[PDB]
């Protein structure tokens, strides 16, 4: 497979420019950083809470294990 | 003015068929983007449906002026038969205007993808030097070094 016999296209225009005629990193800080946060606010709630529990189960996994080797009053 | 205003809009439908003229219209519109030269010659439909007698009056009132006009002729005549007629008729011309902005060049790509057609007219080009620049003589050769061909030459 290659270009030429994939599918159909009709009434579509494409504009584009050389790289040399534009800076590589414009608006990186200015516009990127909100887009980072917007990318963040759409994903954290479905990614973190597993790892949140993991941090806790990693915590309680040690403490209970830590106590068990410590003796009892007898 | 109103009749022709329909004639124009009839043609911008026609030039959809004039695929060669489509390309050069697109091409000039890219490299010279943002400048006046990116404009077409016939113009958008919109301005043709907003044009005025007065804008033409102003346009006429500024560009048609003797210091920026030329008369020329050839054939079985004499240069002095003619010189009186210009001194006769065009002597009444208004013989008295901005200059040029250097129209830059851009390297940019444009692509009007359309698979429903038989073929694809294509164009590519670069900066040209201009008129007075002498190396244009050389380039007209190189265009002819590569020459041309269209589906008919028995060579």
UniProtKB/Swiss-Prot annotation, chain A:
One Pfam family per UniProt: UcrQ
Modified positions (N6-acetyllysine) in chain numbering: 31
Regions that span the bilayer: 38-66
Keyword set includes Chaperone: no
Record bears the keyword Transport: yes
InterPro entries associated with the record: Cyt_bc1_su8, Cyt_bc1_su8_sf
GO cellular component: mitochondrial inner membrane; respiratory chain complex III
Gene3D superfamilies in alphabetical order: Cytochrome b-c1 complex subunit 8
Family in the record: Belongs to the UQCRQ/QCR8 family.
The protein's assembly and partners: Component of the ubiquinol-cytochrome c oxidoreductase (cytochrome b-c1 complex, complex III, CIII), a multisubunit enzyme composed of 11 subunits. The complex is composed of 3 respiratory subunits cytochrome b, cytochrome c1 and Rieske protein UQCRFS1, 2 core protein subunits UQCRC1/QCR1 and UQCRC2/QCR2, and 6 low-molecular weight protein subunits UQCRH/QCR6, UQCRB/QCR7, UQCRQ/QCR8, UQCR10/QCR9, UQCR11/QCR10 and subunit 9, the cleavage product of Rieske protein UQCRFS1.
PANTHER family on file: CYTOCHROME B-C1 COMPLEX SUBUNIT 8 (PTHR12119:SF2), UBIQUINOL-CYTOCHROME C REDUCTASE COMPLEX UBIQUINONE-BINDING PROTEIN QP-C (PTHR12119)
Name under which the protein is recorded: Cytochrome b-c1 complex subunit 8
UniProt organism field: Bos taurus (Bovine)
From Swiss-Prot, chain B:
Organism of provenance: Bos taurus
Name assigned to this protein: Cytochrome b-c1 complex subunit 1, mitochondrial
Subcellular location: Mitochondrion inner membrane
Full-protein residues shown: 161 to 320 of 480
Residues recorded as bearing Phosphoserine in the entry: 52
Residues annotated with N6-acetyllysine modification: 3, 88
Modified residues (N6-succinyllysine): 3
Segments crossing the lipid bilayer: none
Family indicated by similarity: Belongs to the peptidase M16 family. UQCRC1/QCR1 subfamily.
């Amino acid at each position: 497979r290659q270009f030429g016999h994939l599918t159909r296209v009709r009434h579509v225009i494409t504009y584009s420019l050389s790289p040399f005629e534009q800076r590589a990193f414009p608006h990186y800080f200015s516009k990127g950083i909100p887009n980072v946060l917007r990318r963040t606010r759409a994903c954290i709630l479905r990614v973190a809470p597993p790892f949140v529990a993991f941090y806790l189960v990693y915590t309680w996994g040690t403490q209970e294990f830590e106590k068990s080797k410590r003796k009892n009053p007898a | 003015i109103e009749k022709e205003r329909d004639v124009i809009l009839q043609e911008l439908q026609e030039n959809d068929t004039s695929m060669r003229d489509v390309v050069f219209n697109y091409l000039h519109a890219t490299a010279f983007q943002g400048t006046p030269l990116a404009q077409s010659v016939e113009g958008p439909s919109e301005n043709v449906r907003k044009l005025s007698r007065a804008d033409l009056t102003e346009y006429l009132s500024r560009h048609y002026k003797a210091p920026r006009m030329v008369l020329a002729a050839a054939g079985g005549l004499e240069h002095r038969q003619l010189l009186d007629l210009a001194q006769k008729h065009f002597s009444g011309l208004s013989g008295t205007v901005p200059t040029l902005s250097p129209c830059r060049f851009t390297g940019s790509q444009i692509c009007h993808r359309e698979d429903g057609l038989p073929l694809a007219h294509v164009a590519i080009a670069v900066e040209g030097p201009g008129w007075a620049h002498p190396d244009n003589v050389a380039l007209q050769v190189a265009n002819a070094i590569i020459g041309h061909y269209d589906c008919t030459y028995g060579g």
